[PDB]
Structure 1
Amino acid sequence: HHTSKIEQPRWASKDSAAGAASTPDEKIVLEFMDALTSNDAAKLIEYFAEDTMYQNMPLPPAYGRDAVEQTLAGFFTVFSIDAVETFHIGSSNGLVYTERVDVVRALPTGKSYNVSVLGVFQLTEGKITGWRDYFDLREVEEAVDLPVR
């Protein structure tokens, strides 16, 4: 499958280091973003602590590493993440933030959508203890013609 390059939005920061990972935890998060296109829940779960959580905010949360892996495995049964572009990354107080676009493709329909997402990651000892992504679900569902909620 061919995926077109994600363009830079108008509001992308004039600060050239805004998209640069400047700490070990930020670097882990950008590596994790790169790994998303693997569509491989077993690969991704290795980034997570045992005590952890994951939530796409328009949907119910998953608590615990097993449940997070199961949620991811379920997601990748239906969707492919074809590309991730992280415009901005920052962090304070043990939380890392990423402003991104993820290209999501619904396997049942063949249709894709570039999702605008702002995500937050909590890390302890270099492991993810929480990951929440904020975006509008209805836009995605309408674009890929697949109800998710």
Structure 2
Amino acid sequence: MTPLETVQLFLARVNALDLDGACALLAEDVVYDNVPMPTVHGRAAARAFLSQLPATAIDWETHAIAATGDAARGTVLTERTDRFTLADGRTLAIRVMGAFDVADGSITAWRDYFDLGQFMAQMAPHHHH
């Protein structure tokens, strides 16, 4: 599997709510860097972090994807809109770009760039006019 294919598979597995299968593609000591959040280290911690969002449907849409490097190793760049339906019925739609470093079908680092305030506001529950 090429770097591009590895990330395409990762995103497909996330979109099938297969979080265990997706995280299987992360390296054991993966750096998972949501740029405005604390950094996460390792597959298990990445899996646990992702489960903090109680999602019942996930639709991470890829608008553009391209890779550096070769068949074995490279960095895959993505432009996305990450949609979630939560167990309580809340819908999220977060615009994000992400870079994925892949070596031999394993994601060694994953860096997602988005705005935290937008995320936090979408997570919030006259009170106002």
Give TM-score scaled by structure 2 length. 0.80
Does 2:108 align with 1:129? yes
Q: Which runs of 4+ in 1 moved over 4 A?
A: none
CA contact (8 A) 1:106 1:144 kept: no
| CA apart distance, 1:91 | 1.5
Query: 1-side partners of 2:40 and 2:65: how far apart?
Result: 24
* Secondary structure of residue in 1 paired with 2:26: coil
Q: Percent identity?
A: 31
Does 2:94 align with 1:115? yes
CA contact (8 A) 2:99 2:110 kept: yes
Query: 2-side partners of 1:52 and 1:113: how far apart?
Result: 26
CA contact (8 A) 1:111 1:145 kept: no
**Larger relative contact order (CA 8 Å, sep ≥ 6):** 2
Counterpart amino acid of residue 49 in structure 2: T
Query: Which residue in the other structure is 1:89 paired with?
Result: 65
CA contact (8 A) 2:82 2:96 kept: yes
Gapped regions of structure 1 (runs ≥ 5)? 1-22
RMSD: 2.0
Which structure: greater strand fraction? 2
Give TM-score scaled by structure 1 length. 0.71
Gapped regions of structure 2 (runs ≥ 5)? none
Task: Give the 5 Å matches for 1:37-116.
Answer: 37-75=15-53, 78-80=54-56, 82-93=58-69, 94-108=74-88, 110-116=89-95
* Secondary structure of residue in 1 paired with 2:48: helix
